[PDB]
Amino acid sequence: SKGKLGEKISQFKIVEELKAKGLYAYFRPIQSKQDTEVKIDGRRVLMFGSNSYLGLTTDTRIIKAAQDALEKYGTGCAGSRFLNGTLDIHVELEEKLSAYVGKEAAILFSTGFQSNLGPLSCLMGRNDYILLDERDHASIIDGSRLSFSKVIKYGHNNMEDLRAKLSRLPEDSAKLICTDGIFSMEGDIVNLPELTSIANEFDAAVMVDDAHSLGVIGHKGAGTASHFGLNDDVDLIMGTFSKSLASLGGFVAGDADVIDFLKHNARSVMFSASMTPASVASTLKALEIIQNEPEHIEKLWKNTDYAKAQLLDHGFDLGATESPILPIFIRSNEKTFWVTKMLQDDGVFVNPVVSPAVPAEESLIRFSLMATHTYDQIDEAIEKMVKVFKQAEV
Amino acid sequence: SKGKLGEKISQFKIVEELKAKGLYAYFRPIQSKQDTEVKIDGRRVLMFGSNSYLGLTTDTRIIKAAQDALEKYGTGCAGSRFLNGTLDIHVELEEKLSAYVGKEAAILFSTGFQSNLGPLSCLMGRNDYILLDERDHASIIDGSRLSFSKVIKYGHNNMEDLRAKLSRLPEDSAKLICTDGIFSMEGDIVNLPELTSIANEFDAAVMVDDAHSLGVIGHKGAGTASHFGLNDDVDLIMGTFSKSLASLGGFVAGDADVIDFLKHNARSVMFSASMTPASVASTLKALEIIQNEPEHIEKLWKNTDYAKAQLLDHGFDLGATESPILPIFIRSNEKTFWVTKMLQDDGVFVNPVVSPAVPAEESLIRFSLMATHTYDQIDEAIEKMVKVFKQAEV
Ligand SMILES: Cc1ncc(COP(=O)(O)O)c(CN[C@@H](C)C(=O)O)c1O
Ligand SMILES: Cc1ncc(COP(=O)(O)O)c(CN[C@@H](C)C(=O)O)c1O
């Protein structure tokens, strides 16, 4: 029945208003492969709103690996890994990932999102604590909400706040600290050296979400622990396959005893169907390419260094990024929606960040680089962004 | 740091004991496509533990549709539907599903699990209520736990308990009832006529999880509302693609205003990458086949009717199933593990249900039919199950 349900959704008017104003730019229907240019409404559009940092979703070797896995294994496994949904290739990918990030063991999940739900829901329980950076990804907040533990946010990269909040807690309790490696909003990197120094002092477990770090920082892109040399101080490395690795799914890697506990106790792996064969094979092939072909990471960072330099030269106000995410401040929700749609209509795709996710005065567009971007494409996009910022009176 | 973490996992010994006893049969690595026979350890094994009810994960047309989508769209969309992860084909599949289940609109999710997290987390909030059948799927309990509402379980298909618990609640509050359509443990069907009669009396929203119903019950397999004629009394129809539809992902269909609220407010769709092109195309092609080719559903039910008849004739104790899930009672965890492994070693794959998920005295194996099963295969499996139950002294 719909009476109260209709009242619950009645005040959600922003989409109706965006659409009526001709500003709506969510769920833009792409007609082509994710690439440096995409087709929308039959038009070519420069893509600066992707997470495919290495441009690998078009790599013919990865496509062929996926197509061959469809030929051999079919379209799906039709059950949880726990029961009838494990393939030899899922186990192969776990062993490969474990080697890549320097851990004993890994368990796959069908999404990155579910990869955070699993360890955050089941390791800390009643009388225990989870400590979260306040800017942690939504999947980390949700995973921690599924635990029976007490969840505590600390100030963004605020090690004094982290230390203070841990110091308060009963000694006879388990604690887990979970942090993004690279935070996606502002593109900044966790202070892992101090965070792990505090974790070591308080015997708290450390989990790092490397969704934006894998294929980006660390040796051969192995992520945030790898970038700092702190493999030995990080209990659990989580990653997704939907960004650099060009696929869908995720993992958690760690000590064989911890991973064996997760794979038999995490509801998001016991009660959800396993990764499709095609996504296992594309992740496997992408992982090989990232390590074997150093040029992809190198070119991502040449693009990043060039674009950031060009943006600061043109006087754009950037966030404190240390990554291929270039947050460009606009500081008005109305202007952020206008700039986003005007760019779309001039053939540039960027992602808006608005209230209520951020304060109006911190509203911004996110401009993300891919290894496959050319300097010519970057220059075109920035030329068009200078014009739209002028038109918009930012 | 690992001291307290090691203590949290220290008492989880069942896997170590199963493995040391030679009884472990979780995460069995399959080497071949999900089918009526699978290869494990280079041996052929009859598969009676699948959720691929129509056997479609091997359909060459569905494989080719997926391979063609890889060719056209690449290996992934590399972002949320909300931002850069929408394809024309995701929208096509939403329109197709909406038509199939008789609703205005649908939103895809990258897993079935996430399809329950979305509406349960974001529609009911503070001062509202979610009412859950006590046997609801784990993803429904977790989705409801992510809401800021008060979550209330009612007795399994206990309409007097449902009515009583609703009657207690403040009138000035929103209520949502969420139920599995077909419950996977015992294979039973929700009492949707009475549940919707109560929902209508109390103006409570109705959500049905049709993971095991789509491709199984209702006109041309359209699910539980379709089976009862109660499309008009069900607000939200959720489904997965990982069972009859031979793929990965899920959806929620409903009124265009409710679905537009979800697709902009559900964290599991705004903050998780979209379905892979290959899984969109396999779901599209599978959906066509289920409707165009009535023989698949017909043969599922001929197999179901035959196997259930043969099991009751041999004197097996079955659960109160109304579906292709044939729960066979064993009523000892030790015997359930022994029977499961002895079947595996004789070339039969079945799924155990044990403590702590059920009481020891309700432990069982689940024997699930596929349309592609032959009577000869069913007969072989039952002959082997009679022998193992004898060997096991059940
Ligand atoms: C009733 C029900 N709802 C929702 C889901 C989640 O759908 P996905 O597997 O597509 O995420 C399942 C999963 N079932 C299997 C996996 C199980 O519980 O073993 C289910 O049985
Ligand atoms: C830090 C972080 N962790 C985890 C996830 C979830 O991974 P999957 O998308 O593979 O489920 C994301 C998703 N990001 C994108 C989708 C976003 O938030 O728009 C993320 O940014």
Side-chain angles (χ1 to χ4, degrees):
Chain A
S1 189
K2 203 184 182 179
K4 295 288 192 213
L5 176 57
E7 297 176 13
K8 289 303 308 192
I9 71 164
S10 65
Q11 295 309 102
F12 184 71
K13 286 326 214 193
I14 183 63
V15 168
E16 166 201 310
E17 296 191 338
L18 284 171
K19 287 181 182 169
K21 287 176 162 181
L23 292 173
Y24 183 78
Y26 295 110
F27 297 92
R28 287 181 269 189
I30 294 173
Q31 295 175 297
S32 65
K33 48 208 162 165
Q34 188 80 185
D35 206 348
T36 60
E37 292 177 29
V38 293
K39 182 162 80 141
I40 302 172
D41 296 337
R43 304 166 193 161
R44 297 271 284 268
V45 179
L46 288 169
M47 172 53 63
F48 282 99
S50 186
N51 309 294
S52 195
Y53 292 112
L54 303 181
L56 291 177
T57 67
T58 65
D59 187 294
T60 58
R61 298 166 290 182
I62 308 181
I63 292 171
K64 188 56 172 38
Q67 287 167 334
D68 291 343
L70 269 155
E71 196 70 30
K72 180 172 177 181
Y73 292 106
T75 57
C77 304
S80 68
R81 287 291 305 282
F82 190 76
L83 294 183
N84 60 301
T86 297
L87 296 175
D88 57 354
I89 52 168
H90 294 116
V91 172
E92 181 186 351
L93 176 56
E94 291 166 339
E95 292 167 344
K96 289 301 163 196
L97 288 166
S98 292
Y100 182 57
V101 301
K103 293 306 189 180
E104 285 183 358
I107 178 64
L108 310 178
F109 299 80
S110 50
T111 64
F113 192 108
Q114 284 174 205
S115 301
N116 282 321
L117 303 182
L120 294 166
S121 65
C122 74
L123 291 176
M124 300 301 97
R126 280 173 175 267
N127 304 316
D128 302 322
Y129 303 92
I130 296 170
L131 275 286
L132 303 183
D133 194 289
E134 72 188 323
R135 287 208 198 163
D136 275 352
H137 194 253
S139 58
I140 291 164
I141 281 47
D142 288 8
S144 300
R145 178 161 187 89
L146 289 175
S147 83
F148 297 100
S149 80
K150 176 68 192 170
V151 183
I152 300 170
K153 291 180 139 170
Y154 59 89
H156 181 56
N157 248 342
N158 182 344
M159 302 296 103
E160 295 75 23
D161 198 38
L162 174 59
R163 176 181 315 267
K165 278 162 166 163
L166 278 172
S167 78
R168 299 273 77 215
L169 305 173
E171 105 73 26
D172 181 46
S173 66
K175 295 97 172 168
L176 188 150
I177 304 159
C178 184
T179 185
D180 299 24
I182 289 169
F183 286 85
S184 76
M185 174 215 293
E186 210 167 349
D188 52 327
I189 303 170
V190 60
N191 189 347
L192 195 63
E194 193 62 21
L195 185 150
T196 60
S197 305
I198 293 163
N200 285 346
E201 280 194 70
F202 289 92
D203 189 32
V206 173
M207 181 186 164
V208 183
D209 171 341
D210 265 356
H212 294 278
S213 292
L214 295 194
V216 179
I217 59 167
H219 186 61
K220 292 172 178 290
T224 311
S226 172
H227 172 82
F228 286 113
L230 302 173
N231 174 270
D232 211 52
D233 297 297
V234 172
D235 298 277
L236 293 166
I237 300 169
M238 169 276 178
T240 185
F241 306 148
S242 59
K243 305 180 190 55
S244 300
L245 284 164
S247 320
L248 189 81
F251 70 104
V252 175
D255 293 350
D257 62 351
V258 176
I259 291 309
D260 201 64
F261 179 90
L262 289 177
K263 77 188 286 177
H264 300 94
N265 285 272
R267 291 155 71 83
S268 67
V269 73
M270 295 188 294
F271 301 119
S272 189
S274 66
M275 284 171 69
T276 59
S279 288
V280 179
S282 64
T283 301
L284 280 166
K285 185 55 65 170
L287 220 220
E288 292 177 14
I289 293 162
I290 294 173
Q291 289 173 95
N292 289 350
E293 291 179 348
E295 51 262 48
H296 303 291
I297 298 188
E298 175 179 281
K299 196 175 182 300
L300 171 62
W301 279 102
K302 280 183 186 148
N303 285 334
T304 299
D305 290 348
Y306 180 68
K308 188 185 169 154
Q310 286 296 318
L311 286 170
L312 292 171
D313 283 1
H314 286 85
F316 294 88
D317 180 6
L318 310 186
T321 177
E322 307 165 72
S323 69
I325 303 164
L326 305 189
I328 305 165
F329 283 121
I330 295 181
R331 315 203 176 266
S332 156
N333 291 313
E334 189 177 2
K335 291 193 192 288
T336 298
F337 294 125
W338 199 88
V339 163
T340 298
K341 181 68 168 140
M342 290 297 294
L343 281 169
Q344 164 54 38
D345 291 343
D346 205 26
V348 178
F349 195 118
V350 293
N351 289 319
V353 181
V354 290
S355 315
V358 289
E361 340 99 40
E362 269 146 47
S363 62
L364 57 81
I365 58 159
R366 288 171 68 261
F367 179 103
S368 291
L369 286 308
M370 314 167 68
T372 44
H373 280 126
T374 71
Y375 301 153
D376 282 351
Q377 283 171 329
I378 295 163
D379 287 338
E380 174 175 356
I382 294 183
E383 182 173 340
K384 285 183 173 186
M385 285 206 302
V386 167
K387 179 168 196 213
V388 164
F389 274 56
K390 182 182 173 179
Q391 294 184 82
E393 335 261 317
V394 180
Chain B
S1 189
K2 203 184 182 179
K4 295 288 192 213
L5 176 57
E7 297 176 13
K8 289 303 308 192
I9 71 164
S10 65
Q11 295 309 102
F12 184 71
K13 286 326 214 193
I14 183 63
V15 168
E16 166 201 310
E17 296 191 338
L18 284 171
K19 287 181 182 169
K21 287 176 162 181
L23 292 173
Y24 183 78
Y26 295 110
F27 297 92
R28 287 181 269 189
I30 294 173
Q31 295 175 297
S32 65
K33 48 208 162 165
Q34 188 80 185
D35 206 348
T36 60
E37 292 177 29
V38 293
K39 182 162 80 141
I40 302 172
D41 296 337
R43 304 166 193 161
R44 297 271 284 268
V45 179
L46 288 169
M47 172 53 63
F48 282 99
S50 186
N51 309 294
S52 195
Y53 292 112
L54 303 181
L56 291 177
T57 67
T58 65
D59 187 294
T60 58
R61 298 166 290 182
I62 308 181
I63 292 171
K64 188 56 172 38
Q67 287 167 334
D68 291 343
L70 269 155
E71 196 70 30
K72 180 172 177 181
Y73 292 106
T75 57
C77 304
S80 68
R81 287 291 305 282
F82 190 76
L83 294 183
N84 60 301
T86 297
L87 296 175
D88 57 354
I89 52 168
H90 294 116
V91 172
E92 181 186 351
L93 176 56
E94 291 166 339
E95 292 167 344
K96 289 301 163 196
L97 288 166
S98 292
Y100 182 57
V101 301
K103 293 306 189 180
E104 285 183 358
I107 178 64
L108 310 178
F109 299 80
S110 50
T111 64
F113 192 108
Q114 284 174 205
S115 301
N116 282 321
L117 303 182
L120 294 166
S121 65
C122 74
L123 291 176
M124 300 301 97
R126 280 173 175 267
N127 304 316
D128 302 322
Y129 303 92
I130 296 170
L131 275 286
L132 303 183
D133 194 289
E134 72 188 323
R135 287 208 198 163
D136 275 352
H137 194 253
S139 58
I140 291 164
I141 281 47
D142 288 8
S144 300
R145 178 161 187 89
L146 289 175
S147 83
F148 297 100
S149 80
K150 176 68 192 170
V151 183
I152 300 170
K153 291 180 139 170
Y154 59 89
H156 181 56
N157 248 342
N158 182 344
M159 302 296 103
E160 295 75 23
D161 198 38
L162 174 59
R163 176 181 315 267
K165 278 162 166 163
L166 278 172
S167 78
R168 299 273 77 215
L169 305 173
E171 105 73 26
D172 181 46
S173 66
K175 295 97 172 168
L176 188 150
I177 304 159
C178 184
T179 185
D180 299 24
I182 289 169
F183 286 85
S184 76
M185 174 215 293
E186 210 167 349
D188 52 327
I189 303 170
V190 60
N191 189 347
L192 195 63
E194 193 62 21
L195 185 150
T196 60
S197 305
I198 293 163
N200 285 346
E201 280 194 70
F202 289 92
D203 189 32
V206 173
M207 181 186 164
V208 183
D209 171 341
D210 265 356
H212 294 278
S213 292
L214 295 194
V216 179
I217 59 167
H219 186 61
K220 292 172 178 290
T224 311
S226 172
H227 172 82
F228 286 113
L230 302 173
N231 174 270
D232 211 52
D233 297 297
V234 172
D235 298 277
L236 293 166
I237 300 169
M238 169 276 178
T240 185
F241 306 148
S242 59
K243 305 180 190 55
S244 300
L245 284 164
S247 320
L248 189 81
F251 70 104
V252 175
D255 293 350
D257 62 351
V258 176
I259 291 309
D260 201 64
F261 179 90
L262 289 177
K263 77 188 286 177
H264 300 94
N265 285 272
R267 291 155 71 83
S268 67
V269 73
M270 295 188 294
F271 301 119
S272 189
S274 66
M275 284 171 69
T276 59
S279 288
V280 179
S282 64
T283 301
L284 280 166
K285 185 55 65 170
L287 220 220
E288 292 177 14
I289 293 162
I290 294 173
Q291 289 173 95
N292 289 350
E293 291 179 348
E295 51 262 48
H296 303 291
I297 298 188
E298 175 179 281
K299 196 175 182 300
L300 171 62
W301 279 102
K302 280 183 186 148
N303 285 334
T304 299
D305 290 348
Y306 180 68
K308 188 185 169 154
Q310 286 296 318
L311 286 170
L312 292 171
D313 283 1
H314 286 85
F316 294 88
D317 180 6
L318 310 186
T321 177
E322 307 165 72
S323 69
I325 303 164
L326 305 189
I328 305 165
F329 283 121
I330 295 181
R331 315 203 176 266
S332 156
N333 291 313
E334 189 177 2
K335 291 193 192 288
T336 298
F337 294 125
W338 199 88
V339 163
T340 298
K341 181 68 168 140
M342 290 297 294
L343 281 169
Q344 164 54 38
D345 291 343
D346 205 26
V348 178
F349 195 118
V350 293
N351 289 319
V353 181
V354 290
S355 315
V358 289
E361 340 99 40
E362 269 146 47
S363 62
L364 57 81
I365 58 159
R366 288 171 68 261
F367 179 103
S368 291
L369 286 308
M370 314 167 68
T372 44
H373 280 126
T374 71
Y375 301 153
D376 282 351
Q377 283 171 329
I378 295 163
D379 287 338
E380 174 175 356
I382 294 183
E383 182 173 340
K384 285 183 173 186
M385 285 206 302
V386 167
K387 179 168 196 213
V388 164
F389 274 56
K390 182 182 173 179
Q391 294 184 82
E393 335 261 317
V394 180

